[PDB]
């Protein structure tokens, strides 16, 4: 028992950390409808059911939600899949004619601006010699003046505008993220998971749990909850440059809609392409709105206050305040409802001061058609109008707040709803997963000999 003989064993269980290109997978729900009738339905493998997950033991692996891979890349995959969906769709290039435009003959007041502008203009039919005159309706955030005030679409000088095909529907669809043969997805099942550092009990899986990408700046809609404690996931909380993710347990039922009745209309732009505009608005004219249940909202904000008071000392004052500037899509949270995007404001919620010791809450919207999402320099897309009344019931699950850079000994640590980019919308979904590279062929000393 003194000689040391080298041996190498294949199949040794031992892994390392690595950066690698993961592998998508689509549920059979998206596959139920085929021939590209929906979004991201024919670009993934069917997901294998009944996985062979084994509850690991006596393993202490560390996570780091902020300095981890598999999250900076899924944004690239999402944006690439999104961009490739507009190549076979119509272009609006010959549309930017001088719109002779007026106000809808509504019973408006002085403050309540006309949110529909009735604009008429010229267009080129199939016969290239003749030009027709057509009329349509635009929202107030799609016309900028030039000089009976001539209007033009805001992003025409900015870049060419692409129209989304009516066949595709923007609704999120569940996705799965499996690893190519060789890797493993370490997920740790700790209850009070800070997110960084060691995590007690782990488990290796081959595919992720149901993940769905939802574009929403503040108050991420339709998300995944926490287990027992309303969690505040930003270890580095003292520095005020980084946002603070909050995930509270019981969901808040955000119930919104638009009650107008749009009438879709078709115009001929050329031999093969059609321009889908808004016809005549029938019925009543109102303002699209959202409701949140007051008791649930107040109780949830109380819980958030309780859990935030632990990271700043017991005796301190906390007061919220609405967003204080920025673009129209981070000043107030943006969400897609029914295939169209509401820029509905959120100053009726983040207004509560909590010293140390049901009437539905309504909040008004404004609707935009042409969008510049992800702030691509030169891509503006047009959202065709959706016919009728539109509605959606959603699950508010978290917050995205930013502290105030208070000097001296700021006690009333005011927070703001800080939307940031769309990456924090996903970082709360992929905090429990790390991608490990299996490294077989371990080396070990023992006693043996290969005789002859």
């Amino acid at each position: 028992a003194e000689n040391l003989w080298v041996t190498v064993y294949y199949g040794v269980p031992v892994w390392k950390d690595a950066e690698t290109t993961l592998f998508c997978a689509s549920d059979a729900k998206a596959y139920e409808t085929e021939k590209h009738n929906v979004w991201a339905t024919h670009a993934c493998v069917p997901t294998d059911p009944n996985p062979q997950e084994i509850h690991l033991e006596n393993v202490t692996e560390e996570f780091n939600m902020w300095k981890n891979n598999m999250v900076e890349q899924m944004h690239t995959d999402i944006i690439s899949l999104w961009d490739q969906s507009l190549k076979p769709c119509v272009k609006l290039t010959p549309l930017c004619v001088t719109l002779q435009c007026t106000n809808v003959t509504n019973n408006i007041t002085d403050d309540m601006r006309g949110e529909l502008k009735n604009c008429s203009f010229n267009m080129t039919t199939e016969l290239r010699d003749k030009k027709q005159k057509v009329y349509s309706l635009f929202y107030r955030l799609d016309v900028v003046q030039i000089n009976n005030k001539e209007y033009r679409l805001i992003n025409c000088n900015t870049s060419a505008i692409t129209q989304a095909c009516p066949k595709v529907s923007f609704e999120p669809i569940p996705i799965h993220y499996c690893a190519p043969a060789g890797f493993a997805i370490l997920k740790c099942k700790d209850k009070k998971f800070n997110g960084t550092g060691p995590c007690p009990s782990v488990s290796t899986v081959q595919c992720t749990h149901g993940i769905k990408p939802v574009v929403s700046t503040q108050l991420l809609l339709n998300g995944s909850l926490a287990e027992e404690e309303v969690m505040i996931r930003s270890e580095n909380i003292t520095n005020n440059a980084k946002n603070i993710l909050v995930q509270f347990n019981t969901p808040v039922q955000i119930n919104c809609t638009r009650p107008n009745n749009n009438t879709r209309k078709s115009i001929r732009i050329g031999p093969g392409q059609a321009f889908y505009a808004t016809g005549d608005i029938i019925g009543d004219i109102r303002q699209a709105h959202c409701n949140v249940s007051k008791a649930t909202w107040n109780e949830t904000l109380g819980k958030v206050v309780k859990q935030l008071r632990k990271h700043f000392g017991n005796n301190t004052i906390i007061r919220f305040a609405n967003s204080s500037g920025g673009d129209l899509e981070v000043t107030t949270h943006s969400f897609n409802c029914g295939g169209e995007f509401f820029y509905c404001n959120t100053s009726g919620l983040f207004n509560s001061t909590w010293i140390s010791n049901n009437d539905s809450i309504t909040l008004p919207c404004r609707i935009k058609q042409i969008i510049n999402m992800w702030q691509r320099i030169g891509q503006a897309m047009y959202a065709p109008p959706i016919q009728g009344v539109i509605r959606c019931v959603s699950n508010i699950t978290g917050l995205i707040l930013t502290r105030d850079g208070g000097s001296t000994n700021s006690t009333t640590e005011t927070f703001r709803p800080g939307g940031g980019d769309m990456r924090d919308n996903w970082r709360s979904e992929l905090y429990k997963y790390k991608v490990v590279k299996i490294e077989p062929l371990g080396v070990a000393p023992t006693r043996c000999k290969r005789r002859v």
Epitope: T238, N239, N240, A241, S324, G325, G326, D327, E329, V330, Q375, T402, R403, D404, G405, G406, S407, T408, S410, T414, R416, G418, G419, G420, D421
Partner: antibody, heavy 126, light 98 residues
Framework: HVQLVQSGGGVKKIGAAVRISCEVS????????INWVRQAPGQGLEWMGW???????????????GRVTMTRQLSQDPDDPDWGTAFMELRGLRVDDTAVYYC?????????????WGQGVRVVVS | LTQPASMSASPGQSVTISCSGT????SAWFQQYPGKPPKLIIF???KRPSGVPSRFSASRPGDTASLTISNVQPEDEATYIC?????FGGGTKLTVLG
């Protein structure tokens, strides 16, 4: 390199709006929050907030809320996508803020602490 | 953050500057010429940028940040700024006699 310049100081009568421009190039402008630091003669530095040019995010101090606007302008054409201009409009200033304003920034990937600083626009009130 | 107003020194002397408070959240040291943009000279209490003489060193056993300098060069009179993330210290005027 890391090119950053300022413009638009001077002396103004009380009750008017001071515009201060900070123009930056030499690096991708999407990241690297602008931090607006004011330096009052006879005292150490004080901080009056910061701005983020991805979506014009702002984050003020406990004193300037309701008196400052930290606006931005990106580059419209993809010819030069890294030419940014952060504007700060200060309104209704009291007589006691004759100072020098710098538009600092931070390292690659973070925001604290400031490395690069600006020559600094000096503003006086009469 | 209650820094000393000013201090004097002579060439060849080593002096220590103490910053109070900072509640153990990592401080930084800025060197400033009068009417100029200070550039970072100490960050993370353990590193210095390229182009800085090695006579500068900093540490923080507790709340106070201690920055010690040796063999101070006669033309290194300046002002010193203490940084604690968002705040800024009181600064000090270091004058080297000749």
């Amino acid at each position: 390199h890391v090119q950053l310049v300022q413009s638009g100081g001077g002396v103004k009568k009380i009750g008017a709006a001071v515009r201060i421009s900070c123009e930056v190039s030499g690096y991708n402008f999407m990241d690297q929050f602008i931090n607006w630091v004011r330096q009052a003669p006879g005292q150490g530095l004080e901080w009056m907030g910061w701005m983020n040019p991805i979506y014009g995010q702002v984050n003020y101090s406990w004193r300037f809320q309701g008196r400052v606007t930290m606006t931005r302008q990106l580059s419209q054409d993809p010819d030069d996508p890294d030419w940014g201009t952060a504007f700060m409009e200060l309104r209704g200033l009291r007589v006691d803020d004759t100072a020098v304003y710098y538009c600092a920034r931070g390292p690659s990937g973070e925001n604290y602490p400031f490395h690069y600083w600006g020559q600094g626009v000096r503003v006086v009130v009469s | 953050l209650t820094q000393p107003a000013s201090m004097s020194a002579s060439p060849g002397q080593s002096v220590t500057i103490s910053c109070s408070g900072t509640r153990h959240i990592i401080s930084a040291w800025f060197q400033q010429y009068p009417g100029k943009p200070p550039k970072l000279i100490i960050f993370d209490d353990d590193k210095r940028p390229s182009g800085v003489p090695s006579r500068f060193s900093a540490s923080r056993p507790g709340d106070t940040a201690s920055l010690t300098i040796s063999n101070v060069q006669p033309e290194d009179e300046a002002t010193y700024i203490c940084n604690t993330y968002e705040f800024f210290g009181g600064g000090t005027k270091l004058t080297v006699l000749g």
